[PDB]
Amino acid sequence: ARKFYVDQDECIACESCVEIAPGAFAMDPEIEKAYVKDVEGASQEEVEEAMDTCPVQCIHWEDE
Amino acid sequence: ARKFYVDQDECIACESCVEIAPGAFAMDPEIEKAYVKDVEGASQEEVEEAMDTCPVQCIHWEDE
Numbered sequence: 001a002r003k004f005y006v007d008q009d010e011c012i013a014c015e016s017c018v019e020i021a022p023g024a025f026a027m028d029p030e031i032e033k034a035y036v037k038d039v040e041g042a043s044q045e046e047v048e049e050a051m052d053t054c055p056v057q058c059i060h061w062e063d064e
Numbered sequence: 065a066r067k068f069y070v071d072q073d074e075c076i077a078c079e080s081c082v083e084i085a086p087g088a089f090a091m092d093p094e095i096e097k098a099y100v101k102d103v104e105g106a107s108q109e110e111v112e113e114a115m116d117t118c119p120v121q122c123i124h125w126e127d128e
């Protein structure tokens with residue numbers, strides 16, 4: 001799967017990514033930021049949907 | 065994009081598919097059989113892991 005990750009510094013905890021892609025994203029109960037729980041847990045189009053929806057655009061691809 | 069479903073007549077409720085791909089599979093608590101809750105809820109490779117692991121080979125691609 002092309003790699004992706006949440007930049008948790010920026011994350012506003014809206015939960016939209018955990019709603020769109022629940023096999024790939026989860027909330028960390030004690031820092032209140034979202035993180036990738038599985039890079040293979042959503043198809044590439046569902047990942048993109050969650051990335052394009054992020055209000056603060058903090059989920060990034062890492063090709064680099 | 066992908067179409068795959070569980071043939072619930074054969075499903076023995078082992079839960080390996082909802083363990084491997086939780087964003088794509090869920091247990092229907094009523095009949096205790098697995099079904100696809102979101103066809104984009106796992107990458108193609110993660111869906112294959114679940115299909116190949118299925119003990120009764122009851123998860124199929126549409127057109128098989």
Ligand code: SF4
Binds near residue numbers: 011012014053
């Ligand atoms: S969609 Fe963006 S801001 Fe919202 S919880 Fe997910 S990573 Fe954080």
Ligand code: SF4
Binds near residue numbers: 078082
């Ligand atoms: S892995 Fe196969 S038998 Fe096991 S719960 Fe899923 S569909 Fe049913």
